[PDB]
Amino acid sequence: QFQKPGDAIEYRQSAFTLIANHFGRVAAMAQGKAPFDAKVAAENIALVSTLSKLPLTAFGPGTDKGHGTEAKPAVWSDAAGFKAAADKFAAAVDKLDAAGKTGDFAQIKAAVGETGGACKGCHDKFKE
């Protein structure tokens, strides 16, 4: 667990950073800005899948201020809304995980579009 609040903040920020980087490699393939390689897309989606579970466990009470957090207070006051956004994200990643297993480009591109929306959706209401 986290000894101090700052530990939680740093942990979640670190998780989102890793997720962003690996998810980005798959998105580049989907956008045609990088050659498509099923094995590599699979590896990266696998990483995103494993990491996606992590950051959401570090939003406990008391982790609201300090260590440069960009989490809006609404994360807590509207816990219901936050739970929903997290759920959408989880669902989308499941689709991305499956798509990754099949190696089908069209499916992967569709899943990254969905997942990406899940990131933005949550960010609009709870970040910055």
Judged by CB under 8 A, the chain residues 50 through 79 that form the site for its own copies are 50, 54
Chain CA centroid to CA 36, Å: 22
Interface residue with ligand HEM among 34, 78, 122, 124 (CB under 6 A) is: 122
Q: Is 128 annotated as a binding residue?
A: no
Which three-class secondary structure string do you get for the chain?
Answer: CCCCHHHHHHHHHHHHHHHHHHHHHHHHHHCCCCCCCHHHHHHHHHHHHHHHCCHHHCCCCCCCCCCCCCECCHHHHCHHHHHHHHHHHHHHHHHHHHHHHHCCHHHHHHHHHHHHHHHHHHHHHHEC
- Determine the interface stretch with its own copies among 13-21, 79-87, 93-101, 120-128 (rule: CB under 8 A): 13-21
Judged by CB under 6 A, the chain residues 14 through 53 that form the site for ligand HEM are 16-17, 19-20, 23
Which residues define the annotated binding site for heme c?
12-13, 69-70, 119, 122-123
Binding residues, by number, are: 12-13, 69-70, 119, 122-123
Site residues, its own copies (CB under 8 A)? 1-2, 7, 10-11, 13-15, 17-18, 21, 25, 29, 32-38, 47, 50, 54, 103-106
